[model samples]
Target: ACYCRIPACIAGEAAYGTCIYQGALWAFCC
Candidate 1:
């Protein structure tokens, strides 16, 4: 459910997950 930005595309299509990039933390859930 991640909807990352274009500048740093990392919005992988998944039910739920987390990731660390660009000195920041990202997460999402369906």
Candidate 2:
């Protein structure tokens, strides 16, 4: 499984958003 960084990816708890911090997956939340 890859960390989704797209704004339209409804794949996690981020609600079609992934919290990217410091150029990395932060908390998987919007």
Candidate 3:
């Protein structure tokens, strides 16, 4: 799984087209 550090993705999903904030860093969960 990975996340968007930049504004390259914003689908709005939990692990799909969504986004989240990590205390450590950017990582899109899958």
Q: In candidate 3, what are the lDDT values of residues 1-30, reduced to their tens digit?
A: 456544354455344444556543443434
Stretches > 4 Å off in candidate 1? 1-15, 28-30
lDDT scores for all predictions?
0.48, 0.50, 0.47
Model 1 Cα lDDT, one tens digit per residue, 1-30: 346333344444543554566876665432
Q: Candidate 3 at residue 6, lDDT?
A: 47
Q: Determine the C-alpha RMSD for candidate 3 after optimal superposition of all C-alphas.
A: 6.1
Residue pairs whose backbone atoms clash in candidate 3: 2-28, 3-27, 3-28, 11-17, 12-17, 12-18, 13-17, 13-18
Q: Find the 10 residues in a row with the least total lDDT in model 2.
A: 8-17
By TM-score, highest first, what's the ranking?
1, 2, 3
Residue pairs clashing in model 2 are none
| Candidate scoring better on TM-score of 2 and 3 | 2
Candidate 2 Cα deviation (angstroms), residue 21? 0.6
lDDT of 2 by residue, 1-30 (tens): 444554444555444335766777633434
